[PDB]
Structure formats: C-alpha cells, structure tokens
Amino acid sequence: MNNYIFVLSSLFLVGCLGLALKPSPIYGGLGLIVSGFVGCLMVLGFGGSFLGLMVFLIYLGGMLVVFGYTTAMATEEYPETWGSNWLILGFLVLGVIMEVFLICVLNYYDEVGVINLDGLGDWLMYEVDDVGVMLEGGIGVAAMYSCATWMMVVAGWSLFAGIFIIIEITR
Template identity: 40%
Template sequence: MTYFVLFLGVCFVLGALAVASNPSPYYGVMGLMVGSIAGCGWLVSLGASFISLVLFLVYLGGMLVVFVYSVSLAADPYPEAWGSLGVLGSGFGLLMVVVVGAVLGGFIGMGGWVMNTVDCSGVAVVRMDFGGVAMFYSWGAGMFMVAGWGLLLTLFVVLEVVRGVSGGAVRAV
C-alpha cells in the first residue's frame, strides 16, 4: 500500500509538471487528467472516498469542459511537441526544483514520509467522509450555487481570452 501511495504521489507531481511546462493546450489537458486522477487516488487511499469522488467529478466534468472549449478555439496548426529544446529545459528545471525540495525537506535523508492509511487506522463504524455527506448537501447548497456560477463565468472568460482576432464563439450574430 505504501508503494502504491508513493506511486500516486509521483504521478501527481509528474502531472503538475506536465501542466506547468505544457508546450500546447493539448498536453496541458493530459497533465491535468493525470494529476487529478492521482490526487483522487491518493485521497481514496487515505479513506476519503466521497470527497475524492466529488473532486474527480468536478475536475473531469467541469474544468475539462473549459479546456475542451479553449483547445478547440485556440487550435494550433503546428503544435510544439514535448521533445523541443525549450520544453525539455523547462521540464528539467522544474524537476530539479522538486528534487532539491525533496532533499531539503528530508524525504531522501529520513527514509520517507510516515503516513497513516485506512489499513493502519483500524475499522470504524461510520467513516468520516460518509458522515459529512449530509452536511455537504444541507449546508453546502449555497456554495454549490456559487461554484456553478463561478464555473460558468470561468467558461465565458476563457472563451473571451482565446478568441483572438477572429471573433471566437462569443460574438454578435
């Protein structure tokens, strides 16, 4: 279980690196998907399966729609690939920052991080994330409305930003 959680952490960092050093929007979407899947898997291994499912649905159901619209509107005829010199240099620099942070943080010197998972904590009658479902739907209804309007506003902002000189999708008919 520990190796699986470490694998998910590595996938999360690699997904964040892919988003940070993307040469084209196509690759940024793939990095975001890898990072969100790894992060939600990490939450599942910690015992928070409900919040992991909610975050997974929000990221892949909501935010990737914005990326699909932006990729379709800003399609490059000749997208830059991962093998270009600028992208490799940026990725190597970001990877070195992660390695230096891990060394200075004591990850390599102390033999790893200690983490309690569901297997270590024992079995509970009602897990904490299932107890929060009722509170999520009773007190969180207003926040869901605010988040929905925020996502709609984000969609229109991205559509306006990537429209360029051609007019884009939001234009007078």
C-alpha cells in the same frame, strides 16, 4: 507497498510541472486528467473515496469542454507539445533533477520534519477508529443538507447566478 503515496505525490508534482510549462491545451488537459486521477488515488490512500471520485468526474467534465474550446479558439497550426521546444524539454528535465536533488537535500538538512525517506509509510492514517460505522466521507459532504446548510445555499446561488453571468458575457 509503503512508498505508494510518495510515488503518487511525485507524479502529481510532475503533472503540475508539465502543466506549468504550458504546452497546447490538449497535452495540458491530458496532464490535468493524469494529475486528477493521481489526486483521486492519493485521497483514496488517505481513506477518502467519494472526494477522489468526484475530483475525477468533475475534472473529466471540465477537460471535455476545454478540448472543445481549444479546438475552436486556442489552436495553432503547430500545437507545440513538450518536446517541440528544446528549452521546455530542458526545463522539464531540470525540474525533475531539482525535485530529486532538493528531496535529497531536505532528507539531510533536518533529520525528520519536512521529508522522511527512512521513515515513510509509518505516518499516513493517524488514529483510525478500528471499530466504526457511518464513518466514511459522504456523511460530512451530506452535512451540507444538515448542520452545514449555508454552504449548500451559497454554492447553489453561485451556480444559479453563473448561468446568467455566462449568458450576458456571451451575449
């Protein structure tokens, strides 16, 4: 259980690939949800819980509205999923092939430094504090209320002004 993180990273890569091929926003948003779940899992793998869970929550809440809108504006009579186009299917398969081939290549052009398949799982956590408390994420994010009280102001203003911006664009 050492190639866990490489597997998760490659699945995120594949998700963003199928996203970039731009099928209907339904399957596109499905890819977003899969990739956000995978990102949450790898952030957990690096010792981060709150950030991953918030990724998943926020992207779920966004993709819900995306479904609502795409059923209203970005819909066709034939939504054109991945396999509908032999060309897009070929680009997907070629992207996976090039992923494998380029990883095999970067595993050869340099011993280590870019991609390390022989040494894998040895470099994830980098000096944990084996004795600790008040150490998780959530303390840093809660520093927006103390020692980082500018980020909170500026994001709050962003959202507040966004409300008015949306009302006026839709008016």
